[PDB]
Amino acid sequence: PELEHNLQLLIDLTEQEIIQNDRQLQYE
Amino acid sequence: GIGERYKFLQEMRGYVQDLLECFSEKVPLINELESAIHQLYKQRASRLVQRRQDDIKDESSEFSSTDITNFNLEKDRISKESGKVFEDVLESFYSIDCIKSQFEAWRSKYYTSYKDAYIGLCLPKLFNPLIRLQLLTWTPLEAKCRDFENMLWFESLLFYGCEEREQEKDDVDVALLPTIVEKVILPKLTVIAENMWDPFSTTQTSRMVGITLKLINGYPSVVNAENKNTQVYLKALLLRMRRTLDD
């Protein structure tokens, strides 16, 4: 049961983190 | 590497989606299968403690197998049934070496991301159905049971995280071995000792002292006398004898 929300969260986190990495790249 | 990971994670979600849809039926069955062998052992324990005490009373006053074979056939049935409730699941969801290879490659690509996000802590939860399934009927004291070294979970992980670098207290792989052995194996060993061990067998008693020390000697950092779970395990062993006198 826990695996459903937890693994899918990483997918949504990666899409967000790509925007965050780009923001961090742009800032640096 | 996140872009390749994103592709991999989306593939993983579908892969796990079939597993969890299957698991919606099988997770209740894990509790049922575990109860089934424990009740069967309880049937074995209730019958054998009652009859053998009468036999031992006669034998002790002097100095002062049929059920076991029947039990083994049904124990093997439940053992095979447990492996057949998970035979309709792909090998990649239960081969521990396949699972380990994915997470080692994950760390090898994203060491910082694996350590900081504690991704290694997902392994005991994924192995939680698997370790419970493998240790379901296991009791290393019996004449036909495998040793703990002859299982996937122990051999694959025995040197996992035992790197040549100084062991940091927060290194996720260095902390993996204490977490699985203390929090998963020892409560399971407590349940095994309390519900499955038959203390009257002298041969099992000889194996008991040996196997307990073997775990302590193989993991002195984890399975030491100060460890609360090891203490709980040692305390349970004595309490099982007490209950064996009560029944």
PDB file of C-alpha atoms in Angstrom:
ATOM      1  CA  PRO A   1       0.000   0.000   0.000  1.00  0.00           C
ATOM      2  CA  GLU A   2       2.724   2.526   0.999  1.00  0.00           C
ATOM      3  CA  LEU A   3       4.604   1.821  -2.273  1.00  0.00           C
ATOM      4  CA  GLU A   4       1.798   3.358  -4.388  1.00  0.00           C
ATOM      5  CA  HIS A   5       1.964   6.897  -2.976  1.00  0.00           C
ATOM      6  CA  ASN A   6       5.727   6.829  -2.220  1.00  0.00           C
ATOM      7  CA  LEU A   7       6.978   5.736  -5.672  1.00  0.00           C
ATOM      8  CA  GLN A   8       4.552   8.019  -7.553  1.00  0.00           C
ATOM      9  CA  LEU A   9       5.654  10.943  -5.310  1.00  0.00           C
ATOM     10  CA  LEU A  10       9.204  10.553  -6.707  1.00  0.00           C
ATOM     11  CA  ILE A  11       7.881  10.982 -10.275  1.00  0.00           C
ATOM     12  CA  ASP A  12       6.077  14.201  -9.333  1.00  0.00           C
ATOM     13  CA  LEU A  13       9.126  15.301  -7.309  1.00  0.00           C
ATOM     14  CA  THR A  14      11.442  14.732 -10.319  1.00  0.00           C
ATOM     15  CA  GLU A  15       9.275  16.914 -12.592  1.00  0.00           C
ATOM     16  CA  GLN A  16       9.329  19.627  -9.915  1.00  0.00           C
ATOM     17  CA  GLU A  17      13.082  19.124  -9.237  1.00  0.00           C
ATOM     18  CA  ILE A  18      13.871  19.589 -12.981  1.00  0.00           C
ATOM     19  CA  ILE A  19      12.277  23.039 -12.725  1.00  0.00           C
ATOM     20  CA  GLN A  20      14.104  23.556  -9.396  1.00  0.00           C
ATOM     21  CA  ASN A  21      17.453  22.386 -10.852  1.00  0.00           C
ATOM     22  CA  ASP A  22      16.915  24.802 -13.765  1.00  0.00           C
ATOM     23  CA  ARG A  23      16.106  27.586 -11.266  1.00  0.00           C
ATOM     24  CA  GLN A  24      19.213  26.679  -9.262  1.00  0.00           C
ATOM     25  CA  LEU A  25      21.260  26.520 -12.490  1.00  0.00           C
ATOM     26  CA  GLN A  26      19.905  29.935 -13.548  1.00  0.00           C
ATOM     27  CA  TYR A  27      20.620  31.415 -10.094  1.00  0.00           C
ATOM     28  CA  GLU A  28      24.199  30.098 -10.099  1.00  0.00           C
TER      29      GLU A  28
ATOM     30  CA  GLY B   1      20.515  11.552 -14.817  1.00  0.00           C
ATOM     31  CA  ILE B   2      17.172  12.754 -13.416  1.00  0.00           C
ATOM     32  CA  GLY B   3      15.674  12.599 -16.933  1.00  0.00           C
ATOM     33  CA  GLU B   4      16.689   8.954 -17.257  1.00  0.00           C
ATOM     34  CA  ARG B   5      15.511   8.392 -13.661  1.00  0.00           C
ATOM     35  CA  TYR B   6      12.137  10.038 -14.496  1.00  0.00           C
ATOM     36  CA  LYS B   7      11.674   7.595 -17.388  1.00  0.00           C
ATOM     37  CA  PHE B   8      12.746   4.723 -15.095  1.00  0.00           C
ATOM     38  CA  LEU B   9      10.466   5.903 -12.230  1.00  0.00           C
ATOM     39  CA  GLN B  10       7.435   6.145 -14.536  1.00  0.00           C
ATOM     40  CA  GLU B  11       8.210   2.643 -15.823  1.00  0.00           C
ATOM     41  CA  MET B  12       8.653   1.525 -12.187  1.00  0.00           C
ATOM     42  CA  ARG B  13       5.211   2.913 -11.206  1.00  0.00           C
ATOM     43  CA  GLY B  14       3.442   0.779 -13.832  1.00  0.00           C
ATOM     44  CA  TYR B  15       5.620  -2.207 -12.866  1.00  0.00           C
ATOM     45  CA  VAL B  16       4.683  -1.689  -9.183  1.00  0.00           C
ATOM     46  CA  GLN B  17       0.997  -0.925 -10.118  1.00  0.00           C
ATOM     47  CA  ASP B  18       0.442  -4.524 -11.265  1.00  0.00           C
ATOM     48  CA  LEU B  19       2.220  -5.721  -8.092  1.00  0.00           C
ATOM     49  CA  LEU B  20       0.044  -3.627  -5.753  1.00  0.00           C
ATOM     50  CA  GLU B  21      -3.183  -4.497  -7.581  1.00  0.00           C
ATOM     51  CA  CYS B  22      -2.200  -8.135  -7.045  1.00  0.00           C
ATOM     52  CA  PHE B  23      -1.144  -7.255  -3.451  1.00  0.00           C
ATOM     53  CA  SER B  24      -4.641  -5.841  -2.679  1.00  0.00           C
ATOM     54  CA  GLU B  25      -5.750  -9.477  -2.414  1.00  0.00           C
ATOM     55  CA  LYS B  26      -2.401 -10.945  -1.277  1.00  0.00           C
ATOM     56  CA  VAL B  27      -1.656  -8.584   1.693  1.00  0.00           C
ATOM     57  CA  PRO B  28      -4.626 -10.023   3.739  1.00  0.00           C
ATOM     58  CA  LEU B  29      -3.396 -13.495   2.672  1.00  0.00           C
ATOM     59  CA  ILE B  30       0.099 -12.813   4.152  1.00  0.00           C
ATOM     60  CA  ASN B  31      -1.541 -12.369   7.564  1.00  0.00           C
ATOM     61  CA  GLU B  32      -3.721 -15.441   6.914  1.00  0.00           C
ATOM     62  CA  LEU B  33      -0.741 -17.601   5.824  1.00  0.00           C
ATOM     63  CA  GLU B  34       1.295 -16.443   8.835  1.00  0.00           C
ATOM     64  CA  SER B  35      -1.639 -17.202  11.145  1.00  0.00           C
ATOM     65  CA  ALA B  36      -2.145 -20.585   9.394  1.00  0.00           C
ATOM     66  CA  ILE B  37       1.363 -21.898  10.124  1.00  0.00           C
ATOM     67  CA  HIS B  38       1.300 -20.430  13.669  1.00  0.00           C
ATOM     68  CA  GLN B  39      -2.065 -22.081  14.394  1.00  0.00           C
ATOM     69  CA  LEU B  40      -0.726 -25.312  12.855  1.00  0.00           C
ATOM     70  CA  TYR B  41       2.321 -24.991  15.129  1.00  0.00           C
ATOM     71  CA  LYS B  42      -0.137 -24.215  17.967  1.00  0.00           C
ATOM     72  CA  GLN B  43      -1.966 -27.461  17.117  1.00  0.00           C
ATOM     73  CA  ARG B  44       1.411 -29.215  17.082  1.00  0.00           C
ATOM     74  CA  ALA B  45       2.443 -27.510  20.354  1.00  0.00           C
ATOM     75  CA  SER B  46      -0.867 -28.205  22.177  1.00  0.00           C
ATOM     76  CA  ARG B  47      -0.831 -31.886  21.188  1.00  0.00           C
ATOM     77  CA  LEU B  48       2.906 -32.555  21.706  1.00  0.00           C
ATOM     78  CA  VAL B  49       3.410 -30.607  25.007  1.00  0.00           C
ATOM     79  CA  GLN B  50       0.449 -32.453  26.587  1.00  0.00           C
ATOM     80  CA  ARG B  51       1.532 -35.939  25.443  1.00  0.00           C
ATOM     81  CA  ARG B  52       5.343 -35.581  25.830  1.00  0.00           C
ATOM     82  CA  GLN B  53       5.038 -34.152  29.389  1.00  0.00           C
ATOM     83  CA  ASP B  54       3.228 -37.375  30.324  1.00  0.00           C
ATOM     84  CA  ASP B  55       6.045 -39.335  28.642  1.00  0.00           C
ATOM     85  CA  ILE B  56       8.737 -37.174  30.316  1.00  0.00           C
ATOM     86  CA  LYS B  57       6.937 -37.491  33.719  1.00  0.00           C
ATOM     87  CA  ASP B  58       7.155 -41.297  33.528  1.00  0.00           C
ATOM     88  CA  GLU B  59      10.778 -41.069  32.321  1.00  0.00           C
ATOM     89  CA  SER B  60      11.794 -38.490  34.973  1.00  0.00           C
ATOM     90  CA  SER B  61      10.083 -40.446  37.798  1.00  0.00           C
ATOM     91  CA  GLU B  62      12.046 -43.524  36.686  1.00  0.00           C
ATOM     92  CA  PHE B  63      15.354 -41.661  37.061  1.00  0.00           C
ATOM     93  CA  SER B  64      14.293 -39.643  40.148  1.00  0.00           C
ATOM     94  CA  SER B  65       7.430 -38.729  15.536  1.00  0.00           C
ATOM     95  CA  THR B  66       4.081 -39.729  14.013  1.00  0.00           C
ATOM     96  CA  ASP B  67       2.569 -36.282  14.634  1.00  0.00           C
ATOM     97  CA  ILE B  68       5.818 -34.556  13.541  1.00  0.00           C
ATOM     98  CA  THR B  69       5.778 -36.328  10.143  1.00  0.00           C
ATOM     99  CA  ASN B  70       2.076 -35.462   9.737  1.00  0.00           C
ATOM    100  CA  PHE B  71       2.817 -31.840  10.707  1.00  0.00           C
ATOM    101  CA  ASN B  72       5.739 -31.595   8.234  1.00  0.00           C
ATOM    102  CA  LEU B  73       3.504 -32.616   5.306  1.00  0.00           C
ATOM    103  CA  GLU B  74       1.019 -29.844   6.118  1.00  0.00           C
ATOM    104  CA  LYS B  75       3.857 -27.389   6.939  1.00  0.00           C
ATOM    105  CA  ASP B  76       5.332 -28.068   3.480  1.00  0.00           C
ATOM    106  CA  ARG B  77       1.852 -27.586   1.971  1.00  0.00           C
ATOM    107  CA  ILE B  78       1.524 -24.139   3.616  1.00  0.00           C
ATOM    108  CA  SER B  79       5.138 -23.401   2.576  1.00  0.00           C
ATOM    109  CA  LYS B  80       4.372 -24.291  -1.050  1.00  0.00           C
ATOM    110  CA  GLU B  81       0.978 -22.500  -0.827  1.00  0.00           C
ATOM    111  CA  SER B  82       2.780 -19.332   0.297  1.00  0.00           C
ATOM    112  CA  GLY B  83       5.146 -19.644  -2.661  1.00  0.00           C
ATOM    113  CA  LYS B  84       2.146 -20.247  -4.965  1.00  0.00           C
ATOM    114  CA  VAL B  85       0.267 -17.161  -3.733  1.00  0.00           C
ATOM    115  CA  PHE B  86       3.401 -15.353  -5.013  1.00  0.00           C
ATOM    116  CA  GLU B  87       4.161 -17.605  -8.015  1.00  0.00           C
ATOM    117  CA  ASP B  88       1.834 -15.439 -10.169  1.00  0.00           C
ATOM    118  CA  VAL B  89       4.163 -12.495  -9.463  1.00  0.00           C
ATOM    119  CA  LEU B  90       7.251 -11.760 -11.598  1.00  0.00           C
ATOM    120  CA  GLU B  91      10.669 -12.968 -10.342  1.00  0.00           C
ATOM    121  CA  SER B  92      11.919  -9.329 -10.266  1.00  0.00           C
ATOM    122  CA  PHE B  93       9.569  -8.621  -7.297  1.00  0.00           C
ATOM    123  CA  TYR B  94      11.038 -11.366  -5.090  1.00  0.00           C
ATOM    124  CA  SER B  95      14.590 -12.049  -6.311  1.00  0.00           C
ATOM    125  CA  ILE B  96      16.499 -10.016  -3.718  1.00  0.00           C
ATOM    126  CA  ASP B  97      19.639  -9.860  -5.919  1.00  0.00           C
ATOM    127  CA  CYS B  98      17.613  -8.227  -8.723  1.00  0.00           C
ATOM    128  CA  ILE B  99      16.139  -5.687  -6.272  1.00  0.00           C
ATOM    129  CA  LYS B 100      19.581  -4.984  -4.706  1.00  0.00           C
ATOM    130  CA  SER B 101      21.103  -4.458  -8.193  1.00  0.00           C
ATOM    131  CA  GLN B 102      18.536  -1.724  -8.967  1.00  0.00           C
ATOM    132  CA  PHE B 103      19.203   0.189  -5.729  1.00  0.00           C
ATOM    133  CA  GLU B 104      22.993  -0.263  -5.924  1.00  0.00           C
ATOM    134  CA  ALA B 105      22.920   1.150  -9.476  1.00  0.00           C
ATOM    135  CA  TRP B 106      20.638   3.920  -8.149  1.00  0.00           C
ATOM    136  CA  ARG B 107      23.211   4.844  -5.478  1.00  0.00           C
ATOM    137  CA  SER B 108      26.094   4.401  -7.988  1.00  0.00           C
ATOM    138  CA  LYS B 109      24.432   7.019 -10.220  1.00  0.00           C
ATOM    139  CA  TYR B 110      23.035   9.304  -7.449  1.00  0.00           C
ATOM    140  CA  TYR B 111      25.150   8.776  -4.243  1.00  0.00           C
ATOM    141  CA  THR B 112      24.235  12.191  -2.799  1.00  0.00           C
ATOM    142  CA  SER B 113      20.529  11.837  -3.688  1.00  0.00           C
ATOM    143  CA  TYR B 114      20.396   8.266  -2.320  1.00  0.00           C
ATOM    144  CA  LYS B 115      22.099   9.125   0.996  1.00  0.00           C
ATOM    145  CA  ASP B 116      20.287  12.428   1.663  1.00  0.00           C
ATOM    146  CA  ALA B 117      16.804  11.144   0.773  1.00  0.00           C
ATOM    147  CA  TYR B 118      17.348   7.840   2.704  1.00  0.00           C
ATOM    148  CA  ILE B 119      16.225   5.765  -0.329  1.00  0.00           C
ATOM    149  CA  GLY B 120      17.794   2.685   1.359  1.00  0.00           C
ATOM    150  CA  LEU B 121      14.989   2.812   3.989  1.00  0.00           C
ATOM    151  CA  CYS B 122      12.524   1.769   1.261  1.00  0.00           C
ATOM    152  CA  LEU B 123      14.343  -1.578   0.919  1.00  0.00           C
ATOM    153  CA  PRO B 124      13.120  -3.013   4.325  1.00  0.00           C
ATOM    154  CA  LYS B 125       9.527  -2.101   3.390  1.00  0.00           C
ATOM    155  CA  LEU B 126       9.798  -3.699  -0.066  1.00  0.00           C
ATOM    156  CA  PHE B 127      11.474  -6.711   1.563  1.00  0.00           C
ATOM    157  CA  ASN B 128       8.820  -6.696   4.372  1.00  0.00           C
ATOM    158  CA  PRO B 129       6.437  -9.042   2.438  1.00  0.00           C
ATOM    159  CA  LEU B 130       9.508 -10.910   1.089  1.00  0.00           C
ATOM    160  CA  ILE B 131      11.321 -11.424   4.433  1.00  0.00           C
ATOM    161  CA  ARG B 132       8.048 -12.431   6.137  1.00  0.00           C
ATOM    162  CA  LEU B 133       7.404 -14.856   3.248  1.00  0.00           C
ATOM    163  CA  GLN B 134      10.888 -16.417   3.417  1.00  0.00           C
ATOM    164  CA  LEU B 135      10.956 -16.591   7.242  1.00  0.00           C
ATOM    165  CA  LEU B 136       7.274 -17.711   7.361  1.00  0.00           C
ATOM    166  CA  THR B 137       7.781 -21.387   8.218  1.00  0.00           C
ATOM    167  CA  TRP B 138      11.525 -21.047   8.900  1.00  0.00           C
ATOM    168  CA  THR B 139      12.883 -22.285  12.253  1.00  0.00           C
ATOM    169  CA  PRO B 140      16.603 -23.224  11.869  1.00  0.00           C
ATOM    170  CA  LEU B 141      16.490 -25.789  14.717  1.00  0.00           C
ATOM    171  CA  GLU B 142      14.561 -28.449  12.778  1.00  0.00           C
ATOM    172  CA  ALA B 143      16.223 -31.329  10.931  1.00  0.00           C
ATOM    173  CA  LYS B 144      15.170 -30.188   7.428  1.00  0.00           C
ATOM    174  CA  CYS B 145      15.196 -26.390   7.778  1.00  0.00           C
ATOM    175  CA  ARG B 146      17.718 -24.161   6.021  1.00  0.00           C
ATOM    176  CA  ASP B 147      20.275 -22.060   7.895  1.00  0.00           C
ATOM    177  CA  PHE B 148      19.865 -18.268   7.842  1.00  0.00           C
ATOM    178  CA  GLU B 149      22.984 -17.985   5.639  1.00  0.00           C
ATOM    179  CA  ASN B 150      21.217 -20.087   2.969  1.00  0.00           C
ATOM    180  CA  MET B 151      18.616 -17.373   2.257  1.00  0.00           C
ATOM    181  CA  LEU B 152      18.681 -14.515  -0.263  1.00  0.00           C
ATOM    182  CA  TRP B 153      18.143 -11.709   2.298  1.00  0.00           C
ATOM    183  CA  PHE B 154      21.159 -12.622   4.432  1.00  0.00           C
ATOM    184  CA  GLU B 155      23.769 -13.534   1.764  1.00  0.00           C
ATOM    185  CA  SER B 156      23.083 -10.557  -0.552  1.00  0.00           C
ATOM    186  CA  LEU B 157      23.152  -8.087   2.359  1.00  0.00           C
ATOM    187  CA  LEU B 158      25.934  -9.692   4.528  1.00  0.00           C
ATOM    188  CA  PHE B 159      28.578  -7.413   2.969  1.00  0.00           C
ATOM    189  CA  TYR B 160      26.195  -4.663   1.789  1.00  0.00           C
ATOM    190  CA  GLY B 161      27.511  -1.340   3.060  1.00  0.00           C
ATOM    191  CA  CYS B 162      30.656  -2.920   4.582  1.00  0.00           C
ATOM    192  CA  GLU B 163      32.851  -0.522   2.603  1.00  0.00           C
ATOM    193  CA  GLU B 164      36.562   0.063   3.173  1.00  0.00           C
ATOM    194  CA  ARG B 165      35.804   3.660   4.257  1.00  0.00           C
ATOM    195  CA  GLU B 166      35.336   4.652   7.920  1.00  0.00           C
ATOM    196  CA  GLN B 167      31.758   3.740   8.885  1.00  0.00           C
ATOM    197  CA  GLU B 168      29.784   6.972   9.208  1.00  0.00           C
ATOM    198  CA  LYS B 169      26.849   6.689  11.627  1.00  0.00           C
ATOM    199  CA  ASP B 170      24.504   8.281   9.039  1.00  0.00           C
ATOM    200  CA  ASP B 171      25.667   6.375   5.938  1.00  0.00           C
ATOM    201  CA  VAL B 172      22.437   4.751   4.685  1.00  0.00           C
ATOM    202  CA  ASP B 173      24.079   1.492   3.558  1.00  0.00           C
ATOM    203  CA  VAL B 174      26.145   1.237   6.763  1.00  0.00           C
ATOM    204  CA  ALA B 175      22.841   1.765   8.639  1.00  0.00           C
ATOM    205  CA  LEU B 176      20.919  -0.718   6.426  1.00  0.00           C
ATOM    206  CA  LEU B 177      22.343  -3.889   8.060  1.00  0.00           C
ATOM    207  CA  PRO B 178      21.514  -2.750  11.684  1.00  0.00           C
ATOM    208  CA  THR B 179      17.995  -1.711  10.581  1.00  0.00           C
ATOM    209  CA  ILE B 180      17.041  -4.986   8.849  1.00  0.00           C
ATOM    210  CA  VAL B 181      18.644  -7.328  11.431  1.00  0.00           C
ATOM    211  CA  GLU B 182      17.461  -5.477  14.573  1.00  0.00           C
ATOM    212  CA  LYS B 183      14.003  -4.230  13.533  1.00  0.00           C
ATOM    213  CA  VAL B 184      12.799  -6.946  11.092  1.00  0.00           C
ATOM    214  CA  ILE B 185      14.681 -10.188  11.857  1.00  0.00           C
ATOM    215  CA  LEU B 186      14.683  -9.979  15.688  1.00  0.00           C
ATOM    216  CA  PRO B 187      10.892  -9.284  16.054  1.00  0.00           C
ATOM    217  CA  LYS B 188      10.346 -12.117  13.551  1.00  0.00           C
ATOM    218  CA  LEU B 189      12.745 -14.316  15.592  1.00  0.00           C
ATOM    219  CA  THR B 190      10.758 -13.353  18.704  1.00  0.00           C
ATOM    220  CA  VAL B 191       7.497 -14.457  17.017  1.00  0.00           C
ATOM    221  CA  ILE B 192       9.242 -17.646  15.766  1.00  0.00           C
ATOM    222  CA  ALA B 193      10.588 -18.490  19.244  1.00  0.00           C
ATOM    223  CA  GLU B 194       7.261 -17.715  20.972  1.00  0.00           C
ATOM    224  CA  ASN B 195       4.966 -19.563  18.526  1.00  0.00           C
ATOM    225  CA  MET B 196       7.002 -22.138  16.553  1.00  0.00           C
ATOM    226  CA  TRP B 197       9.838 -23.473  18.744  1.00  0.00           C
ATOM    227  CA  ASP B 198       9.193 -26.689  20.702  1.00  0.00           C
ATOM    228  CA  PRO B 199      11.546 -26.423  23.741  1.00  0.00           C
ATOM    229  CA  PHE B 200      11.407 -30.145  24.666  1.00  0.00           C
ATOM    230  CA  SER B 201      13.629 -31.199  21.736  1.00  0.00           C
ATOM    231  CA  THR B 202      17.159 -31.648  23.124  1.00  0.00           C
ATOM    232  CA  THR B 203      18.625 -31.432  19.590  1.00  0.00           C
ATOM    233  CA  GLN B 204      16.908 -28.073  18.965  1.00  0.00           C
ATOM    234  CA  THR B 205      18.182 -26.878  22.377  1.00  0.00           C
ATOM    235  CA  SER B 206      21.761 -27.735  21.325  1.00  0.00           C
ATOM    236  CA  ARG B 207      21.243 -25.811  18.075  1.00  0.00           C
ATOM    237  CA  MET B 208      19.578 -22.948  20.048  1.00  0.00           C
ATOM    238  CA  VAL B 209      22.687 -22.036  22.082  1.00  0.00           C
ATOM    239  CA  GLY B 210      24.890 -22.343  18.984  1.00  0.00           C
ATOM    240  CA  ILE B 211      22.641 -20.347  16.624  1.00  0.00           C
ATOM    241  CA  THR B 212      22.053 -17.509  19.162  1.00  0.00           C
ATOM    242  CA  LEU B 213      25.810 -17.034  19.687  1.00  0.00           C
ATOM    243  CA  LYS B 214      26.382 -17.282  15.900  1.00  0.00           C
ATOM    244  CA  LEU B 215      24.136 -14.256  15.276  1.00  0.00           C
ATOM    245  CA  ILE B 216      25.812 -12.314  18.120  1.00  0.00           C
ATOM    246  CA  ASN B 217      29.317 -13.223  16.887  1.00  0.00           C
ATOM    247  CA  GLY B 218      28.539 -12.357  13.261  1.00  0.00           C
ATOM    248  CA  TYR B 219      27.107  -8.929  14.141  1.00  0.00           C
ATOM    249  CA  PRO B 220      28.741  -7.754  17.440  1.00  0.00           C
ATOM    250  CA  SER B 221      27.974  -4.131  16.501  1.00  0.00           C
ATOM    251  CA  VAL B 222      24.240  -4.865  16.158  1.00  0.00           C
ATOM    252  CA  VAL B 223      23.320  -8.127  17.932  1.00  0.00           C
ATOM    253  CA  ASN B 224      25.064  -7.240  21.209  1.00  0.00           C
ATOM    254  CA  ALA B 225      23.948  -7.551  24.839  1.00  0.00           C
ATOM    255  CA  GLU B 226      23.085  -3.825  25.009  1.00  0.00           C
ATOM    256  CA  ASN B 227      20.657  -4.016  22.052  1.00  0.00           C
ATOM    257  CA  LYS B 228      17.055  -3.823  23.320  1.00  0.00           C
ATOM    258  CA  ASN B 229      15.758  -6.119  20.543  1.00  0.00           C
ATOM    259  CA  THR B 230      18.466  -8.692  21.284  1.00  0.00           C
ATOM    260  CA  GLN B 231      17.534  -8.378  24.979  1.00  0.00           C
ATOM    261  CA  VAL B 232      13.855  -8.853  24.012  1.00  0.00           C
ATOM    262  CA  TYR B 233      14.912 -11.946  22.014  1.00  0.00           C
ATOM    263  CA  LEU B 234      16.906 -13.359  24.968  1.00  0.00           C
ATOM    264  CA  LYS B 235      14.017 -12.612  27.365  1.00  0.00           C
ATOM    265  CA  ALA B 236      11.480 -14.280  25.025  1.00  0.00           C
ATOM    266  CA  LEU B 237      13.536 -17.515  24.979  1.00  0.00           C
ATOM    267  CA  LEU B 238      13.248 -17.857  28.771  1.00  0.00           C
ATOM    268  CA  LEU B 239       9.540 -16.914  28.729  1.00  0.00           C
ATOM    269  CA  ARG B 240       8.799 -19.593  26.097  1.00  0.00           C
ATOM    270  CA  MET B 241       9.968 -22.266  28.583  1.00  0.00           C
ATOM    271  CA  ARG B 242       7.559 -20.815  31.186  1.00  0.00           C
ATOM    272  CA  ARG B 243       4.579 -20.997  28.783  1.00  0.00           C
ATOM    273  CA  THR B 244       5.684 -24.526  27.768  1.00  0.00           C
ATOM    274  CA  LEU B 245       5.231 -25.497  31.432  1.00  0.00           C
ATOM    275  CA  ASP B 246       1.847 -23.741  31.543  1.00  0.00           C
ATOM    276  CA  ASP B 247       0.412 -25.605  28.539  1.00  0.00           C
TER     277      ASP B 247
END
